[PDB]
Design a protein around this ligand. Structure first.
Ligand SMILES: [Zn+2]
Ligand SMILES: [Zn+2]
Ligand SMILES: [Zn+2]
Lengths: 134, 114, 65, 266, 46
């Protein structure tokens, strides 16, 4: 506990002392690039899709989204997207590599001009660790 | 994330003996027992009992770092007496003391009406 | 939000005592310090658990879905 | 009778006040440590969530379910799943609990530790019963639901110790004192004018003779006689917190004797 | 059985597919949710 450090009762931490919820929200648009080129929400197939993420795409339902409730982890693909140009490059959204958790909620919408866009919430519970500031 | 599994505190590792008895170089008839997956609970208990043994010249234990559940216990005895035997006797004495403690608590508890 | 089961410091179950405490205050008019003590919460670690709780859940329930 | 002696002062379902004489402080403490940390208990360890329409998070709830005390009387005839021979869990190593709750009422619907139901075969052993100390007989308040608020989940309770998680801690606070008159000179009393006036006299002062100023310091004097109070959470009865504590420490020492025994072979 | 998407306010299930119209049946509101996976999630109670 020297030089501004402190000791925590690991017993208390287990009992719920200082735990917290954590929610991050990932967004993605289905953009329209002119008269012909349109991005798509789907599960990319590795044969006809370039520059795929090394992460896994299995947690995607055929609409290109993970259903809420699935547990995720680093580098995994939350939102599947392709930007057709010619067959098509991979424009998917992976979960931050330094994080993990369970998907809390996933919503599908259109905006002011009607571009399909989807928001994904991810919930983790952060339990007080060592370099944690108080 | 860099957090070790909680069972690592008590559950022995792959090919890891509870005891590792190494001999002390610096002193005659002295030894160093490393106790894996153990803490103060046992260390201070044993050390204090070896102190009661008259034929025991030196006894001390230390938890070299708190991230690891292990402790080094150093035993030095008079010539002819073996430190492993010293440890064996102190271990036994402790058990026999606890045996009486249980018996005595049990008897006293049974007398209570609450 | 929502009464902690077990006091953080010693782990005495405090999960059952909530409604009982809130009752000893409305129904019995009793002051906080006596109600806590009635409920057998003697150590201040246990006392602080109930005494300083904010049951936010009750607001959370006010939203429809 | 023999070696160290006990003299119980008060008893209940929840507390044991006693005096431990003819013992080493090291022993009194080692027992105190074991009671807190090494006595096995049954507690919810896996929570599979089928439905949750609540205002609370799946894991928020999950966490609470572990802290709910379960009957661990016959905990000794249950195996640690790690040591058990199945694939995950079974009857020989676990207790399966079920919880289905729904807001039928226009008023707030409460979810209690009483609402837990055992689905696994108990092998007729005193285990996995949610401990209810509650006057109204409800036990721990897990959750609150409104209308269409449903909570459907499954719990797997497993044998464990407080070292792995504090949920398997069968004891609440353990009171521990010795030498209520500082005869041993084990503390240097901080004061402003008088340490005797400034520092409150212990309860246990009555169970010991005051030092009487006109006497020299007893250096030869050693620490024996310990005024303790063991508080139970429910899982195990107060007496068995003491007994099982004595026994665990005894078993812990036996392992060392045995280890030395296996080492003698080579 | 099967509820592809749920409604934000009225909480009525929807089950729609690609190019069906992003709106609810009765209420207007284009909000709409996703409904939990049927692949049941398990958590350690620590
Ligand atoms: Zn407390
Ligand atoms: Zn099994
Ligand atoms: Zn609607």
């Amino acid at each position: 506990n020297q030089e501004d450090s402190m000791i925590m009762n690991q017993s208390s931490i287990d009992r719920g002392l200082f735990r917290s919820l954590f929610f991050r929200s990932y967004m993605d648009q289905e953009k329209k690039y002119g008269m012909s080129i349109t991005e798509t929400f789907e599960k990319p197939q590795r044969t006809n899709t370039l520059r795929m993420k090394h992460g896994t795409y299995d947690k995607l339902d055929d609409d290109g989204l993970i259903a809420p409730g699935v547990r995720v982890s680093g580098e995994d693909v939350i939102i599947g997207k392709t930007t057709p140009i010619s067959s098509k490059r991979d424009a998917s959204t992976p979960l931050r590599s330094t994080e993990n958790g369970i998907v809390d909620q996933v919503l599908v919408t259109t905006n002011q001009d009607g571009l399909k866009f989807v928001k994904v919430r991810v919930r983790t519970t952060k339990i007080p660790q060592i370099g944690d500031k108080f | 994330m860099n957090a070790p599994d909680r069972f690592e505190l008590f559950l022995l590792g792959e090919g890891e003996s509870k005891l590792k008895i190494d001999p002390d170089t610096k002193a005659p008839n002295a030894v160093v027992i490393t106790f894996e997956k153990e803490d103060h609970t046992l260390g201070n208990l044993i050390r204090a009992e070896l102190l009661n043994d008259r034929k025991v010249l030196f006894a001390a234990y230390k938890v070299e770092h708190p991230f690891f559940a292990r402790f080094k216990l150093r035993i030095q005895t008079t010539e002819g007496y073996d430190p492993k035997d010293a440890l064996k006797n102190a271990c036994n004495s402790i058990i026999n003391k606890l045996g009486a403690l249980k018996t005595n608590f049990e008897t006293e508890w049974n007398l209570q009406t609450l | 939000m929502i009464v902690p089961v077990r006091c953080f410091s010693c782990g005495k179950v405090v999960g059952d005592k909530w409604e009982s405490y809130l009752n000893l205050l409305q129904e019995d008019e009793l002051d906080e310090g006596t109600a806590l003590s009635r409920l057998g919460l003697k150590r201040y670690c246990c006392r602080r658990m109930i005494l300083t709780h904010v049951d936010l859940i009750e607001k959370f329930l006010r939203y429809n879905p | 009778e023999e070696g160290p002696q006990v003299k119980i002062r008060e008893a209940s379902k929840d507390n044991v006040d006693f005096i431990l004489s003819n013992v080493d402080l090291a022993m009194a403490n080692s027992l105190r440590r074991v009671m807190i940390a090494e006595i096995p208990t049954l507690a919810i360890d896996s929570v599979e969530v089928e439905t949750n329409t609540t205002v609370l998070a799946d894991e928020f709830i999950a966490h609470r379910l572990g802290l709910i005390p379960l009957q661990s009387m016959d905990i000794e005839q249950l195996e640690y799943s790690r040591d058990c021979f199945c694939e995950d869990h079974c009857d020989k190593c676990s207790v399966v609990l079920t919880l289905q709750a729904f807001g039928e009422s226009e008023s707030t619907t409460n979810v209690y530790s009483k609402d837990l139901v055992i689905v696994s075969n108990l092998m007729g052993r005193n285990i996995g019963h949610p401990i209810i100390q509650d006057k109204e007989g409800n036990g721990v308040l897990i959750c609150k639901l409104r209308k269409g608020q449903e909570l459907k989940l499954t719990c797997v309770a497993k044998k464990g110790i407080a070292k792995e998680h504090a949920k398997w801690g069968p004891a609440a606070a353990i009171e521990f004192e010795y030498d209520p008159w500082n005869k041993l000179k084990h503390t240097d009393y901080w004061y402003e004018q008088d340490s005797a006036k400034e520092w409150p006299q212990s309860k246990n002062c009555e169970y010991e003779d005051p030092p009487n100023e006109g006497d020299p310091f007893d250096y030869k004097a050693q620490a024996d006689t310990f005024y303790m109070n063991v508080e139970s959470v429910g899982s195990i009865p107060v007496d068995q917190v003491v007994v099982r504590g004595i026994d665990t420490l005894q078993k812990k020492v036996a392992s060392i004797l045995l280890a030395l025994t296996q080492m003698d072979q080579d | 059985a099967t509820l592809k998407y749920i409604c934000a306010e009225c909480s009525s299930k929807l089950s729609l597919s690609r190019t069906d119209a992003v709106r609810c049946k009765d209420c207007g509101h284009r909000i709409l949710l996703k409904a939990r996976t049927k692949r049941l999630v398990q958590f350690e109670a620590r």
